[PDB]
Every structure is written in C-alpha cells, then in structure tokens.
C-alpha cells in the first residue's frame, strides 16, 4: 500500500555540565533503519536494519555529517528559545523535530511534513501546502518571520517532494523482502474467570506488521463497548506489534461475543469466538 519515511530528533539541554543529549532515529513505515545517539561511542549514524547496511562509505559519511549538523542547529536553538521565553540557564529544556514524506501505492509523492516543538508543545510547523507556517505563539511567530525571509519552506518543499521520495523508493526496493511484506496478526482468545459466574474474554493479536490494527467486540452481532478494555498497540521487540481487547461476560454466555480483527495483512477481517 502506501509508504512513509520519517525522521525524529530530540535534543535535551544539560544545564549542569556539557552539551545537550541528541538522539535521531529514522523510520521507513514502522521499521527503524538508522539511529544517532550523542552519548554513544561511534559518533556516527548507525544502521538498525539489514537492508541499509549495504549502503557504502559515502552514504554513512554523509548521513553522519548531516545528523551532526542537525544536532548543532538544535543546540543553538535551545539557547535562542531560552532567550525568547526569558528562561533561566538553570533548567533543562527540549527541542523536538520530525519530518518526512508519504507516497501512495504508485510510490508517487502524497504528503510532506516538517514540524518542531519546544518543551513538548507545538512550536512551528510547515503546513500541508509546503509553503506556509503554523506558529503556535509569539516566539514561534518570530521564527516564522525569520524562516519566511530565508526561503526555508522552499528548501523544505524541494526535499520533501524530491529527495525524500527518491530515497524512500530506494529503501523500499532494497528492503523489499520485509518492507513490502505484511505480517497478518496471529489471533487467539483466552478466558479468565473473575468470579464463579463471570469471566473475562481476551482477544489477542500478535506478531503483526504494520502496527495499524483494529480490534472490536460485538455481542449478538452488534458493537459492544461497555465492560471492555483495549490496550495500546505495543512492540513485541522483534519488529512486530501486539494488541489485545477484553470484555467481561456472564459465564455461560460466551458464544454471544465475537472479536473482530482488521489489519492490512488480512484479505478479509477475522472473527473469533471463545467456544
């Protein structure tokens, strides 16, 4: 189906001594493929998926140079923002940035994004037109004027619509064996008595990819939300994801209840019953 490339950057100031902690991660869809950590020994961009390892020295030298440049920009920004907000040199603050591109099934450009946060709140973001800026407050408005004058959106648009998509396509090809494979959820139901006349039914979806999934309960063919619990989708640790949904039912009435599983890896949704 559709695909995306996304980079996430976090810089955290360390007022007591030294420079900010800087961490960058890159993803294709729900697969991490590179990382940089200022605390790590290599001081280089590092591979985190087999299909990126085939890239040669010029690639790794270039990604390292760029990620260090990103880190210096964020380091300077921490000082600038402290000033904008009249904050003390005493406290730790955070800059976050995320950017990337989406393509459709035809691998053509669909959407781009580039957004920036200070202390966990929206600061400035490129609009979907890739021309305009959303500034959350008056400090961000100062940045917006600066970025208008420096043609920033033009450069960002060029990267998002061109370079970003070109390299996404390259990665999708090189990592096709996994990146273009869907792993359907392996599903089962468990039963846990909560008294001698009521029980929890838990509907499990395991080892699936991508992370997107929907789990729903029905009773007698109609949606059931009362007495249900749905946990947030969580990583298994091997590149796949997990989720469960549960419902409390009167014992003996289990057959009324059906769990419904929707996932891109399933041609048709699955229905599970206790039995």
């Amino acid at each position: 189906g559709s695909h995306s490339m996304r980079y996430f950057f976090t810089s955290v100031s360390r007022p007591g001594r030294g420079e900010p902690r800087f961490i960058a991660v890159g993803y294709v869809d729900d697969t991490q493929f590179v990382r940089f950590d200022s605390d790590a020994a290599s001081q280089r961009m590092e591979p985190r998926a087999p299909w990126i390892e085939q890239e040669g020295p010029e690639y790794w030298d270039g990604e390292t140079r760029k990620v260090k440049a990103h880190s210096q920009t964020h380091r300077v920004d921490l000082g600038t923002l402290r000033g904008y907000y009249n904050q003390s040199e005493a406290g730790s603050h955070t800059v976050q940035r995320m950017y990337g591109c989406d393509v459709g099934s035809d691998w053509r450009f669909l959407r781009g994004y580039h957004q920036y946060a200070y202390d966990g709140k929206d600061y400035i973001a490129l609009k979907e037109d890739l021309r305009s800026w959303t500034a959350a407050d008056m400090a961000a408005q100062t940045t917006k004027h600066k970025w208008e004058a420096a043609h920033v959106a033009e450069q960002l648009r060029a990267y998002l619509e061109g370079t970003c998509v070109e390299w996404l396509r390259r990665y999708l090809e090189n990592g096709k064996e996994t990146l273009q494979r869907t792993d359907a959820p392996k599903t089962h139901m468990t039963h846990h008595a909560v008294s001698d006349h009521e029980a929890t039914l838990r509907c499990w979806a395991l080892s699936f990819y991508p992370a997107e999934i929907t789990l729903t309960w029905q009773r007698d063919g109609e949606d059931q939300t009362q007495d249900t619990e749905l946990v947030e989708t969580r990583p298994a640790g091997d590149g796949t994801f997990q989720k469960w949904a549960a419902v409390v039912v009167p014992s003996g009435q289990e057959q009324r209840y059906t769990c419904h599983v929707q996932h891109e890896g399933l041609p048709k949704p699955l229905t599970l019953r206790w039995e």
Binding site: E63, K66, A69, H70, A150, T163, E166
Partner: peptide, 10 residues
C-alpha cells in the same frame, strides 16, 4: 536520507 539543509535556526 537526511535533509542536507537543516541550518536555519529558530
């Protein structure tokens, strides 16, 4: 592949 122009400060 990272953007090679992230140099405009806030």
């Amino acid at each position: 592949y990272l953007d090679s122009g992230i140099h405009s400060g806030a």
